[PDB]
């Protein structure tokens, strides 16, 4: 497919297939580029273009290894601001990719895993590159993500309420209470533990919740 | 309703009459933690108040419950033992 | 992909995690205070100038 | 001598500095003649160096290097049975791959290890040949040739030390086959060492359950018979001189459940000892304590084997643990669906004791989900108190939904298309959806079936269904029969147990008909309705809006909900008409769901499928004929055409048909053939007995990555549908169905290829017993 | 599929069927279907011109070797036990001395039938069947059993004199280390390649010497007809180890005079200084005793299924498990005769003695051969 060419002759055609939007061959060029020249001078920049070609072709299992490969090539880079975003971005596409949105159905209760794995990377990013342009974006991803977990965990804390499992209600909320200071899912789990307490005759603790209910409706 | 079939529901996290004898007011949470372990609830914004609370639905024959709240002080030295059944 | 009545031309790509707003903090009263974050939510709350979503670069 | 410049010739994978620092004399260093020789082997110590020849011009080093870097390809030839990646795993075991340093010293060494792989795999008579084929600018192809003579096969095992049982009956327990006849093939005979290891334990069990408590395998030596085929074994054991279970001496943390333990150690003193029973009996306590809250019920027994009397005494040491191990539960792999669907499919509550029975039932609740691939969890005892276990249900889902398609009438014609779609577990909500219907020039059918399985939290499985069949039997729009049929029926989930559940529902059905055919049993129904029209004209209309109470009940014991292995699911369904209906009748039916694993590998599973159905009037009336039972053509019997097994219709002479298209649709029509004739169309019976005999079989030609998705099963599918109210007086030149003995048959093999949208089932069958004839399509292609 | 699924490496055929000295049989008197393609170490006896031959099926014969007419016949195919209706199932070859037909059975129950009638003059259940010939000399039945033990058993009644493990490989690495009574020492080879001299009279190790490094990290053969039974010329053992590594080594210390580790030799006879041997490719060679300096070879026999080479009619005679016999020009290699007396072939060996050549073919057992 991609034969023995000069590396730039591979790379410009890879840049062509990137600018053609043909990530399929742009993956196929850049691999045999770094197969023929892993000692390529831009073999690191092959990977950044590869994850570019992976993600635009939606190729996270290739983008999983390459982000680890870029670390395993050299874990120190100026390009981690791409990569640590792109790993969270990989986890963002790994979080949810289904089509249920136009059905009036949301995906914020499905995967906490690559949610938190993105929340791992995006927090590492705003740790590792608070200077890079991604930090405006990645923080807003993190802003979105905690409530996405909260709504997910609210949907968990919903079920034990609809189950009536009030002991299983509380600690699910007690997680969110020691997780989220701002999320409205926590603000709306806030009345229910009071109820769960009053179903558990912990009315006294529930009026102590009802203060916070008053205080966080304030 | 008029349906004798209702499925049973249980909760867990309670203690025995031997277990409530295993501690006294004045004892540590650790002394509860040695004899009874911890329960699966305490008072998070307030003092050490350990909750061995049971809930149970039999199946359209009543509802069953046993609440055991164990208020220590902040030091974890026990200050209150309150057993509470259903209703 | 391609089409002739064209409601297929909406293909992948979004900034969904960018679109919302942040949320409203805790104002719990005295004595009813419990710790609010134990998770990984202790992030460095900062930005790095703009360039968000599709405006974010791809190197 | 201090080198001014080192000349780095032919490195090609390593850097100059990766060459330079590995030289024990670097540039600018004092050069020694030992350091010349040190530059030889340390550069050779890369393994990428084919030559190192270190010279200088006075002091300025010139290191003449040829290079053995990257293998650029690895080619296999002759491995045809075995996967050559398993062979490549031995290269990965030797640190060798494509893009890895060539080392021609390691050719025969790994070649040995592939033949040592062959030595271990059950061959020894198998050679390999790595052929180094040099590729551009440093590179090499690992062409690999494999010269496989023969594997080793089981021949005969000597057993010594057995002195009560047969050698031969011991082999009958085993994996160890050394016979496949010229007129029998049940499998193969080949060797593997790990078969023997369990067959030690198969033997080790086999004496232990008798009583043999001084039983011990002395040694076991496989003959290295000099033929490269002969697998002969001496296995040396000590017999054991069987001992009695004379008593149980349980001890330790009995946790107050000690009487239950005594029920769990209800034993016989003097019983000829069975440690496998004890192997069971200890875990019954661990299952007892697994429901009594204790997740680490440490039970360490001790058989005080008393050789003075040939008895054992059974010390048991119990350590229960914590009473409330269940903290909470984690649920993962929900990345498509809703977890509250899965979390309502559990029976363990958080903040509880360990109930082990609550776990696996909830796992069985996910087993009877049928929209999954792995049911699996991690009972993580959280570090801290042993009140903390968080049980982590990382599970794998499966494809939902199915379309089915059976279109005809050409692509170039008018309004005609067949449809049908399912989205059971709609969008992770669990909503059981299946929707069909058609717009045809023969009908306009509408159909819906949606279910909230949990409209109440118990599992009120609120399922709504409706239909609208505006059928016309297209001669003009009429003239065979007009029939608009429509109505609805909603039925909910009624838990009789957690494996038993009832159904009960009410069916609205309006049918509106005109120009019906003069023919006997259709009109025999009408005469049972007291309606006796003109028997030579289709000048007849009929309007019915029947109201019926429907019901059902499900026994639910089969393992998976999509791919089970064992059990039985008895799913009763039936109906009765109510007052206000336009006809007073009923129908009752039942089809079974029984799996019979041939071996308890559950690889071959017999699928016992028979079907029952009976429909009748409620006294003085009749069940109508459209719900008479129909069969054949992948119904319960394959290889026929659809709904072709049953009683067959007898037509009156039509002298009016309201239209005839000049001798077309001939059913004794108004033009031609107008006589009392019998159609080969199956009119169907008021009673049904059809069955299908299915037997799961694996196939070696499929990878079991996806052979476990594909179910292959032969059959001999027979059945009878018959009319218990059939007569000989109305049917005298016409055959009879008053007898139940109306049995057709068609036989073949079934297959499902589980596509990315699930099984798309194809079926061939061929009739070898046919009761009075039907219509046949021997190959059938379904979904 | 299965016409294309096959894979078998090649074994060279038999060329050169010669009949320069017209070979015959003396007679056939065959016991029956003998060992067959079943593997055991059975081999008949011909003492006092009596063919003590049997089959591993169970029929035992004594054949008066003139047409091999029967002297006596018994059947140690037994009838009941923890297995009922026993066959013979013999592990050790037919040894006869005294009124005792010493045979090792795969039952690990060994016998000594009164040679006048074949009634069991004594018998013994022993620790494992014999992996070698019942070596019977000096009051002692010298056994290399399955367990690698030097099982010494009294030949007069079946009293175990001792039982001492020499060489225990990873599995039954099948070596025929028949413990040779040689010059007062228990001289025995190895199923590993570790060779040894032990005391004959008590089982006291004179020495034990490693020669062949066994398969598993030093991989060796499982087709070769390796005589791991030793041969001593009084001070020097001239023997093969477990793969066929030929070694001249001292009787009393085990110290190597010379060794052909290059040999993976199948069979051998030390004929003076002309060790007439069967090479590993089922071809012929012959080396010295003064070094392993090769005298000659032959590869007309090549990849055949051979028995031992014997000296009959002044000729190097050899048979094979394809049922041929063959007559090597004893020094100069050449086929002089070829008697394909059967096709059943031989797992026992030719016995170029009593003026005859005793074999037990696999199915047509006893042919007595002449030319």
From Swiss-Prot, chain A:
It is a lipid-anchor. The keyword Repeat does not apply. SUPFAM superfamilies: TPR-like. The keyword Signal applies. GO terms for biological process: Gram-negative-bacterium-type cell outer membrane assembly; protein insertion into membrane. GO terms for cellular component: Bam protein complex. InterPro entries: BamD (IPR017689), BamD-like (IPR039565), TPR-like_helical_dom_sf (IPR011990). Keywords: Cell outer membrane, Lipoprotein, Membrane, Palmitate, Signal. CDD domains: BamD. It is found in: Cell outer membrane. It holds the Pfam family YfiO. Belongs to the BamD family. Part of the outer membrane protein assembly complex, which is involved in assembly and insertion of beta-barrel proteins into the outer membrane. Constitutes, with BamA, the core component of the assembly machinery. Part of the Bam complex, which is composed of the outer membrane protein BamA, and four lipoproteins BamB, BamC, BamD and BamE. This is Outer membrane protein assembly factor BamD. It comes from Escherichia coli O157:H7. The gene is bamD.
Swiss-Prot record, chain B:
Coiled coil: none annotated. One of its GO terms (molecular function) is protein-macromolecule adaptor activity. GO terms for cellular component: Bam protein complex. It comes from the Bacteria. It is a lipid-anchor. It is found in: Cell outer membrane. One of its GO terms (biological process) is Gram-negative-bacterium-type cell outer membrane assembly. Keywords: Cell outer membrane, Lipoprotein, Membrane, Palmitate, Signal. Belongs to the BamE family. Part of the Bam complex, which is composed of the outer membrane protein BamA, and four lipoproteins BamB, BamC, BamD and BamE. Part of the outer membrane protein assembly complex, which is involved in assembly and insertion of beta-barrel proteins into the outer membrane. This is Outer membrane protein assembly factor BamE.
Curated annotation (Swiss-Prot), chain D:
It is found in: Cell outer membrane. Its main location: membrane. The keyword Transmembrane applies. One of its GO terms (cellular component) is Bam protein complex. The keyword Cytoplasm does not apply. Belongs to the BamA family. Part of the Bam complex, which is composed of the outer membrane protein BamA, and four lipoproteins BamB, BamC, BamD and BamE. This is Outer membrane protein assembly factor BamA. The gene is bamA.
